[PDB]
Amino acid sequence: ELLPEIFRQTVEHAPIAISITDLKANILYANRAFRTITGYGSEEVLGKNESILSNGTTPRLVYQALWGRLAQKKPWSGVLVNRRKDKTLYLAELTVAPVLNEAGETIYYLGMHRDTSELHELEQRVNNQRLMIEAVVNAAPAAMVVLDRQHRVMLSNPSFCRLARDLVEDGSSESLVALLRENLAAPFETLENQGSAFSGKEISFDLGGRSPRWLSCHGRAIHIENEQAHVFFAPTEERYLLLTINDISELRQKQQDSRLNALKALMAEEELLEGMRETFNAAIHRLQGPVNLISAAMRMLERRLGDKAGNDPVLSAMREASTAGMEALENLSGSIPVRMAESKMPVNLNQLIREVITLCTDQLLAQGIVVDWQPALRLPWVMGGESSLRSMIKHLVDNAIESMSQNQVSRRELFISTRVENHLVRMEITDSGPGIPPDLVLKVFEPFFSTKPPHRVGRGMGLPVVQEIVAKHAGMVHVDTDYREGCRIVVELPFSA
Amino acid sequence: ELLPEIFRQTVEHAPIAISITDLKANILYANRAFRTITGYGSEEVLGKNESILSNGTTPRLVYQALWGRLAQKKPWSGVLVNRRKDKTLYLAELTVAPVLNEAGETIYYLGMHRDTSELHELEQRVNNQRLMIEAVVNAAPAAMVVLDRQHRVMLSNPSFCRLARDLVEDGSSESLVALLRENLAAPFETLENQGSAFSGKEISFDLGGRSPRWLSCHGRAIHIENEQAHVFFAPTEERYLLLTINDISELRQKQQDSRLNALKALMAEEELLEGMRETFNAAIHRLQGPVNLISAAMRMLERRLGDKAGNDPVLSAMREASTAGMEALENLSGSIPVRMAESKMPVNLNQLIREVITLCTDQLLAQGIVVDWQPALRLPWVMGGESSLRSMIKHLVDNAIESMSQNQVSRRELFISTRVENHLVRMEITDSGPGIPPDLVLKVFEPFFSTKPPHRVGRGMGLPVVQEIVAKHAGMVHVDTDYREGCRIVVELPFSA
Amino acid sequence: MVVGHTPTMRRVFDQIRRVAKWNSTVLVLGESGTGKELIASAIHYNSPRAHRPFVRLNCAALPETLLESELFGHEKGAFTGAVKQRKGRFEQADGGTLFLDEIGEISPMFQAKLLRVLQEGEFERVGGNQTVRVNVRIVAATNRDLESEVEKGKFREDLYYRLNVMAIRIPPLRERTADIPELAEFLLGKIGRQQGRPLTVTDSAIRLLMSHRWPGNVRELENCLERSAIMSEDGTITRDVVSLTGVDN
């Protein structure tokens, strides 16, 4: 109904490249924008084939589809890459439709296209940014995973899969995520609800038979804005959840070893210190007896004989024997070590017993001995030398263990308990052995007496030593005679209130 | 430029929604595409206002620019969220131009838009996937930096910035990369040139006076595809670098302490058993003297008494004194610790002298003692029990420290040296203590000898244990008579050729 | 708990925890106030028998008939006053430490009996004939000059030799005056802390301690410092305050 010139002006004033071509695609008309977008002048456009805009990158299937549907008198729609006069390349969404005369015959072709360079620049930037997550994920040695609001695994790395393969039977990242959620608990829920990044939460897994794996857990909220076209003026954000899981297993356990090793090291000197004191306590003792008997004898033979005593060769005989010993007793006594005041420091008795048991656990399991340790929940710390109180534990436990090898031990068990009785730290080490014969319960405490032969490590000194350590604390150590299914040694030592 | 009728068919077959409207924007004509794009039928469109396409989501401000720019006969270009007949919304890059009559007066208006929804859904997805990079990195503990082909910091987390503040003076991420780049070397070069993932590259940094900080470094390649519109059908990839660094410093520092501590127990346990064995000889030798002299008294006393020997109270007790002496001598001899078979193995004393000083460093520094250790460059292995040979050095050091502690020493120096002589491994420990008087050089080795004042911990047993264990190793130990500035003890032990 | 640093103390102190460990008899030679009971007590607390009964017996305070009865035990009606059968000290303290104060006042006839027990660890009741082997420990002690008694025949020589086997001669405080400052401080510090006020002794009294022959050793020392503190209103034990305790110069 409108004037034909209006349609002529409609194409002319468009800001997009519009061209009218012949059946050979030779451009017969072009608007202002076609000159502007394509860079061709008004006079330069007439007569040139549209094939010039092709750069060869477009698949030939696109052009044949373009031309093929034109032969069918049907429009064809698709996206091309056109080249401007300055040879710059832009994505041109070209659709070509036939011009039908009043008789329905195709007389001319119509070429329109719009710049869509931004479209590709952003999907590839999307594709690049999609590659960014995939690549960065692959790098983390810490098992890291990104979780959506439904906690679906969007991307995982080999390490997380390796952790899934190492922590989960199936080896799938998704299965590994499920287990981690239960253990994380509060940091995960806080991250999910408030998006608060959590870092450095340690959790523990005791899977049995293998050293528990201790993991450093970190996480943050990862935010995606809305993409849909209708939210261009007001994008809205969603939230994923990042979980970063780092291996710190050997780190925390190795703290235990050194203190465990300094534990056995520091104590290890005392049994020598008591041993050297104890071993030498035998020297004068065995000497002090026979020697003094002689020391009297000179005063004996002297008094009755009186004047003739000085001429008695017998009177000189014991004198020489007594003097030689008396020299030893003085020299032996005079060079005895005087213990230095070992720094009296706060000692956690439960801490040590849990620890000494760790050192001696291997030889307990070697005999099949079940170690049932029940540290007191509240045990006061004793102001004393940690090394010395530490040493006496090994002496008592070891000898009881050797009873665990005897066939009277129907069930091989080591029982260690600590309790405060009579205002003293009562240490009871009960065992399931044949025990000590009632008549020898103390003769074993005699230095150098060992019911098992001294031909093994049985110097008859372990029981004397524990007393000396106990005695140095003004304590008392006894074997519970009521228990007969083994030997129960009771040590009572003062503690700092 | 062409026949007017072509332009009318040009608009009708135009792929985009083209409508010709009056001055009020009421559509007077609609093309095929307007039907296809907006969903409005040919007849439903004629006479209807363009407001049917308006949804109200687009800000009204642009519409004044739309209508306003038409007044001055200028094109207006902008993007609107148009509404289709089905009420679906899409991004419409609308341009409105005036229709002029042959006299230059505006007679009609032109409505013309293109679909740009795909453009926005990706740029937001760009911003969305961009925010994935920004967030995920922050909470990760391992220090990571995203590096371009020129090693410029593309991304860094607070820890990396903290690490820069910790590893580099300026605290900048870029400068941290410079420090990190130098140390990585080959794994970084392999990753950069070939994109090969490297994991677990551990590097040690020694701060000086502090525990060296060990960093576990891991790195993977990041891939970016080309974004320009001209590679829509064939994107090209480039490579960036991610380094991921985890701190493993604390573990290694604690690792040395355990071995140092665990070995402290070994020596202390060993010297106890060895210390036992030598005290036996002193006790047996010490006992043998008086006991035998007691013994001789009986027979010589018996001969004079004759028949009166039977009823002599003097003889009976001294008779027992030897009997007790015989029992005392037997008790000492038969109770010697039968060492569990000590595997006589090749032992390198140079390894042990390094240990003891590290083991004994604590006490040496307390007294301001300077320790000069001169290990032999090539020390042949000493055949013998590693347990026995390990206790050797501490015994000699214990000799120096105790006398070293005596206040008669104004200058406190300790010198240790080792060398091979006469097919034997000869070791010497020299200190600046009171020393051994020349007449006491040899009888300090008779067991238990000690001239140290009782105030100190003088066992008199160090050298004797050395003498004891040296005898076990078929060697010889003596103190150098020539040295008078202190004590120089010489230990000779044969080595496995 | 026990202080001393002279060479004589090296024997006595080291002998304490030495014989503490073993089952051997102990003769504690020393005059009054030397510490014989506490030497045995320090011996016991340092003995493995620290957890077992520690028996102190004064052989001079009991009649000979009761002395023989007490150590080995007696049957009912063995002597006047034996209303009930009593277990012997050897057996009541079997596995314990027996402190026998003033061991040198025993009669010659019993001395033969004690000899056999100390040799074999075997003994007979007073009136019983069952030989019992016992892991009994003994701690004898005597201030008497047994040498005069054996010289005079009132003490059997065979046992006296067996009794002076473990002779730990506690030296008089006269020969260890260097230990007096260290001996006094432990008591003075303990009583000063115990009373809640500093119980300090003046220098004039200290000079007396250095020059004192010490017939009573530390017992006379202890009886004075504790009484002196009482009438020292501030605890500052002055020599006049020292004098009020009755210690002869």
Ligand SMILES: Cc1cc2nc3c(=O)[nH]c(=O)nc-3n(C[C@H](O)[C@H](O)[C@H](O)COP(=O)(O)OP(=O)(O)OC[C@H]3O[C@@H](n4cnc5c(N)ncnc54)[C@H](O)[C@@H]3O)c2cc1C
């Ligand atoms: C109105 C109109 C506008 C066009 N606008 C563009 C544009 O903006 N950008 C662009 O790249 N291309 C455009 N073309 C297509 C252009 O004409 C070429 O087909 C294209 O550029 C490929 O040229 P070539 O030399 O690389 O390949 P060619 O092999 O020359 O052609 C590619 C395919 O098109 C067929 N074809 C080419 N010319 C004809 C013809 N005259 N008749 C029948 N089939 C034919 C060929 O048989 C072959 O299948 C337009 C075509 C028309 C009719």
Ligand SMILES: Cc1cc2nc3c(=O)[nH]c(=O)nc-3n(C[C@H](O)[C@H](O)[C@H](O)COP(=O)(O)OP(=O)(O)OC[C@H]3O[C@@H](n4cnc5c(N)ncnc54)[C@H](O)[C@@H]3O)c2cc1C
């Ligand atoms: C050819 C053409 C095509 C258009 N296509 C669209 C489209 O696809 N989608 C869309 O949302 N809008 C389109 N508009 C704009 C439309 O006319 C309205 O401005 C818009 O829909 C907002 O309407 P409203 O009722 O919310 O605001 P209103 O207040 O009704 O109008 C918005 C502003 O435009 C001015 N204005 C409105 N009509 C006229 C007029 N006839 N002459 C002068 N000024 C006027 C008003 O003064 C006001 O400042 C088009 C306009 C023209 C001329």
Ligand SMILES: Nc1ncnc2c1ncn2[C@@H]1O[C@H](COP(=O)(O)OP(=O)(O)O)[C@@H](O)[C@H]1O
């Ligand atoms: N818990 C125990 N169970 C059984 N026997 C024990 C126990 N503790 C000690 N003994 C006995 O005590 C004797 C002496 O031990 P001890 O004097 O401690 O040093 P050693 O065990 O080195 O000989 C041993 O022969 C042993 O039979």
Ligand SMILES: Nc1ncnc2c1ncn2[C@@H]1O[C@H](COP(=O)(O)OP(=O)(O)O)[C@@H](O)[C@H]1O
């Ligand atoms: N390294 C040494 N430094 C100083 N004096 C020593 C050293 N070694 C030995 N002596 C002297 O020799 C004596 C005997 O030493 P030894 O038999 O090793 O045991 P102890 O050193 O414990 O007495 C000591 O009394 C000491 O005076």
Ligand SMILES: Nc1ncnc2c1ncn2[C@@H]1O[C@H](COP(=O)(O)OP(=O)(O)O)[C@@H](O)[C@H]1O
């Ligand atoms: N070596 C010592 N160190 C500290 N105090 C001592 C020492 N010897 C004795 N005493 C003190 O002497 C007091 C009495 O000792 P006691 O046992 O009566 O000696 P004795 O048996 O000679 O009478 C005790 O209270 C004790 O504290």
